[PDB]
Amino acid sequence: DQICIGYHANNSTEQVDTIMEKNVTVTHAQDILEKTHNGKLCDLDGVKPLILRDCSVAGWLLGNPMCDEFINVPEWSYIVEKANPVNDLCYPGDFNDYEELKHLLSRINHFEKIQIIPKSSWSSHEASLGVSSACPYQGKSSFFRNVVWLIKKNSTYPTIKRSYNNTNQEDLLVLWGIHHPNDAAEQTKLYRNPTTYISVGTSTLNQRLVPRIATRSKVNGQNGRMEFFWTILKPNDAINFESNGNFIAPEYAYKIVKKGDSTIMKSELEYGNCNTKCQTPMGAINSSMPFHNIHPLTIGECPKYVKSNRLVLATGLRNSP
């Protein structure tokens, strides 16, 4: 008669690593690393992202005629932009402090576009001929929809002195610009005055832009350049414009109605018709694992990213052969 002491074995082939031994077969183990995703861009807890598709943030905000899909976009959870969107600045140039603005958008979930300087209210200047073949719409020469390219009227460009007041409660994103013409002849042809400027003032801002003449390469068929600028106009503050040529005036500006958690995600993927609590640039994640290895840039309630291929904890004991 005997009594023996012993331990459990089973048919398990699960393996764990240790410092002194790799591939130890154990009776039970627990994987803690999520390796799968759905490969789609999804709504984040019901709230759909802004998918700019072929438009860039600049094309969207300035109102590139090719980006009319985004003329009035609802509240978003995150933003998705391709690596090299084709519809950026149709008319060539620069967007000043562009990256600082994009960073500002990571704290914004909703814009409401409003009209601050009506197109018709330009009585001493021509405001309906500010177009170019570089920004076509339906086969015709058009232009950035949110700013007005003003030119001389009856052979004169009188000094502009406009002011807008932020009466509404929400911070306002105001966008304007300046045209750099190709030569002295083009300058007088469009604006009469040879030496011009645009002065912009707010509570904080004290700007004075001057056009910069230069022989330049053609880009999208244009020699001229457009340099765009922006500011955040506080509540109860007024923006003050003064110019005698080359002024690209604001028509529409954006109210910042919702602030909060957001991000600009770089991805070539389109919309997936899908929902998730955790999103990455290559697909959404749905699991209870404490870790994943899909991609470091996530948004939502996510597991923690690690660069491992495998994380498996032993729970049971060394299994017998």
């Binding site: 023996c4 074995a9 154990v26 009776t27 870790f291 923690k304 990213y305 049971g316």
Partner: protein, 162 residues
């Protein structure tokens, strides 16, 4: 293993013991069979469960990368940003992988220890009323029927009675 029981003086585990991590096998004239030791098994389940949760909990506050863009003449700070992000991922990857390796070793040893202690608990009861065979088993000098066997699992084996 460190404690010598699992795949040591006990050559291998038991496919036949289904209801616990550790336990007893008995053999007498009435028959034979397996019985799980509830107490040591439950202590093991609690320890491993606390460990897993402890591991999950400690890694819950960890670096999260964010998108930042830089122009063509901001390459230095772009590079700084890249190296910072990557640096933390490498630190956390290291932390996770090492914790798993280290605690897997401790978990396997923990089980070995629980088996060894269970074997000693029984050895300390039987004392000189049984031959210690060397393989996890004790061979009795007297007939040990099922209620005699139960008393050994009890912690109640009345040594002076035999």
């Amino acid at each position: 293993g460190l404690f010598g029981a699992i795949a040591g003086f006990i050559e291998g585990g038991w496919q036949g013991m289904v209801d616990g991590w550790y336990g007893y096998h008995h053999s007498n004239e009435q028959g034979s069979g397996y019985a799980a030791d509830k107490e040591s098994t439950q202590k093991a389940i609690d320890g491993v469960t606390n460990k897993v949760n402890s591991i999950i909990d400690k890694m819950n506050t960890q670096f999260e990368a964010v998108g930042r863009e830089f122009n063509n003449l901001e390459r230095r700070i772009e590079n700084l940003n890249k190296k910072m992000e990557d640096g933390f991922l490498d630190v956390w990857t290291y932390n996770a992988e090492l914790l798993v390796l280290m605690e897997n070793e401790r978990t396997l040893d923990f089980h070995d220890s629980n088996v060894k202690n269970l074997y000693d608990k029984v050895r300390l009861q039987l004392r000189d009323n049984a031959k210690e065979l060397g393989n996890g088993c004790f061979e009795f000098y007297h007939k040990c029927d099922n209620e005699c066997m139960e008393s050994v699992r009890n912690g109640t084996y009345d040594y002076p009675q035999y």
